[PDB]
Amino acid sequence: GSISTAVIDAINSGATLKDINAIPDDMMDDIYSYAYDFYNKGRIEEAEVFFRFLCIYDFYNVDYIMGLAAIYQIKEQFQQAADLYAVAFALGKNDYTPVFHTGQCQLRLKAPLKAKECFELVIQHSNDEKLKIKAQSYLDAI
Amino acid sequence: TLKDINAIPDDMMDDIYSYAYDFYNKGRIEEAEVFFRFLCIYDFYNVDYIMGLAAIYQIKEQFQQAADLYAVAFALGKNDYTPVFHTGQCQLRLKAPLKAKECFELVIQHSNDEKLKIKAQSYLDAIQ
Numbered sequence A: 001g002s003i004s005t006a007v008i009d010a011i012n013s014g015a016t017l018k019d020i021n022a023i024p025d026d027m028m029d030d031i032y033s034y035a036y037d038f039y040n041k042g043r044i045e046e047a048e049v050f051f052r053f054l055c056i057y058d059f060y061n062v063d064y065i066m067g068l069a070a071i072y073q074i075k076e077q078f079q080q081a082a083d084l085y086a087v088a089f090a091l092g093k094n095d096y097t098p099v100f101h102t103g104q105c106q107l108r109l110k111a112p113l114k115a116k117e118c119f120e121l122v123i124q125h126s127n128d129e130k131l132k133i134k135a136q137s138y139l140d141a142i
Numbered sequence B: 001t002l003k004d005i006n007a008i009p010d011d012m013m014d015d016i017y018s019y020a021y022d023f024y025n026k027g028r029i030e031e032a033e034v035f036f037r038f039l040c041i042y043d044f045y046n047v048d049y050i051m052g053l054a055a056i057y058q059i060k061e062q063f064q065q066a067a068d069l070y071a072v073a074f075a076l077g078k079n080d081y082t083p084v085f086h087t088g089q090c091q092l093r094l095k096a097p098l099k100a101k102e103c104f105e106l107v108i109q110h111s112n113d114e115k116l117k118i119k120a121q122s123y124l125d126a127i128q
């Protein structure tokens, strides 16, 4: 998947498509907009292809990662979702939304201690008061 | 992948990893790089294999290449902020001090590794 592609690219250290500016920013923006068009209409499989395409071209992009992670979470591919959410967090640093969703994923993976660690991070560090309430509700059930 | 089918016994992979760090510790960077690339081809999902290849790229002053692998390494481990610390070092070398500050601050705010936080704070103290 997307993470494997990123690691293979890093191993090979040959020229990538982004290295030669093969697809301009405005064009990537358009494709991202089509990806969400598909997603918003329930065409999840088509959206997944488009987000995978975007992540092959520019893996280290929070918006593309988050779109793909959401698809995996909806498809109950919870480990794949959690891994991508953590990449998004590492790149973005100040949005705890990916940490919250990783906590949801860890609960479904039967890892409540990992989920508790996620939800506690949201409470301790997020300034999103509504997200903190949501995180607390999961903590209350654990 | 090769790991998915147990293509090489576990103890032999342990040996190859230990030989890779032996090369690294002895300054045989080109040979360490072959061995860490081999390991990451065998199992891209192994955080310590990725960290070893990232260390090679950092020592070779391929700082963005290292930082990219550190972001994957962070995700695979979820709660180990060592890759975030090293990303902070790479960002300083890339002349991105605000990004580096964000990395070191993330280590101090989330890590439970006291020795790592001490190191991260020493970098924050030096950043203008």
Ligand SMILES: NC1=NC(=O)c2cc(Cl)ccc21
Residues within 6 Å of the ligand: A085, A086, A089, A098, A099, A102, A114, A117, A118, A121, B078, B079, B080, B110
């Ligand atoms: N420190 C952390 N423990 C976790 O389980 C986790 C998940 C994510 Cl997404 C970011 C950071 C962390």
Ligand SMILES: [Cl-]
Residues within 6 Å of the ligand: A001, A002, A003, A004, A005
């Ligand atoms: Cl993958």
Ligand SMILES: [Cl-]
Residues within 6 Å of the ligand: A076, A077, A078, A079, A080, A081
């Ligand atoms: Cl999965």
Ligand SMILES: [Mg+2]
Residues within 6 Å of the ligand: A009, A010, A013, A014, A016, B065
């Ligand atoms: Mg490259």
Ligand SMILES: [Mg+2]
Residues within 6 Å of the ligand: A123, A124, A125, A126, A127
């Ligand atoms: Mg607060």
